[PDB]
Design a protein around this ligand. Structure first.
Ligand SMILES: O=C1CC(=O)NC(=O)N1
Ligand SMILES: [Cl-]
Ligand SMILES: [Cl-]
Length: 229
């Protein structure tokens, strides 16, 4: 359903609907923002029904969150899960090829068959962006338009759960969530973003997957099975 018209209880998974209650009005306001963009003749990505897709996997099952900046800017790439693409997309976006190069260097696994990250989402990884929409061809075009309050609320709610959490924060916009992760059940890994523009400043060699698993094991949580087909 549409974010302007329908309540969180309809839009997102039950635990997420309770977690996001402080931003219920703000999510409806974003639906009105997106409506105004279409009225004005501007486009947005991902598709309306995918914008909140990260919050359709169970809140109670999240062990790791990965946070990027904003969705892929090329039509046909963004699917509402950060960095993921549909299984028939080729070539992979360059950021995703960089992620997979680090995945193979860190974990020793072969390169994945395709760019679909839904196994991670189905295994306790929240695939979040700091901002949940973008105008085509214009990275960061929806920065400061109201999504930040929504993703801040999501992180605060996860951090408050009586459960371990590991956050992987890629880039500067994602790292504005670090203050909200201060509680002792939460630990944050931060690096430069995997974009070609920033990856060589510290994404490559950062070993985020193995490190997140070492942190989860030190907190007595089950490691993520990162292996993609
Ligand atoms: O281009 C992209 C895709 C994504 O989902 N997240 C990012 O930060 N960058
Ligand atoms: Cl447009
Ligand atoms: Cl950045």
């Amino acid at each position: 359903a549409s974010m302007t018209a329908r309540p969180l209880s309809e839009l997102v998974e039950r635990g997420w609907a309770a977690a996001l209650e402080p931003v219920a009005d703000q999510v409806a306001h974003m639906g009105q923002f997106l409506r105004a963009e279409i009225a004005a003749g501007r486009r947005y990505l991902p598709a309306g029904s995918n914008v909140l897709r990260a919050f359709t996997f169970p809140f109670d099952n999240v062990r790791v969150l990965i946070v990027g900046q904003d969705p892929y800017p090329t039509p046909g790439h963004a699917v509402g899960l950060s960095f993921s693409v549909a299984p028939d997309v080729r070539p992979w976006p360059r950021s995703l090829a960089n992620i997979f190069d680090e995945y193979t260097a860190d974990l020793g696994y072969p390169l994945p068959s395709n760019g679909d990250l839904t196994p991670w989402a189905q295994r306790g990884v929240l695939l979040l962006n700091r901002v949940l929409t973008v105008r085509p061809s214009n990275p960061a075009s929806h920065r400061g338009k109201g999504w930040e309050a929504v993703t801040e609320c999501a992180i605060r709610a996860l951090a408050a759960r009586a459960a371990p959490l590991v956050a992987i924060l890629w880039g500067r916009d994602a790292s504005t969530l670090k203050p909200m992760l201060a509680a002792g059940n939460c630990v944050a890994i931060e690096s430069p973003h995997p974009s070609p523009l920033s990856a060589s400043r510290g994404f490559f060699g950062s070993r985020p997957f193995s490190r997140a698993n070492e942190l989860l094991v030190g907190m007595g949580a089950e490691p993520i099975d990162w292996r993609l087909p």
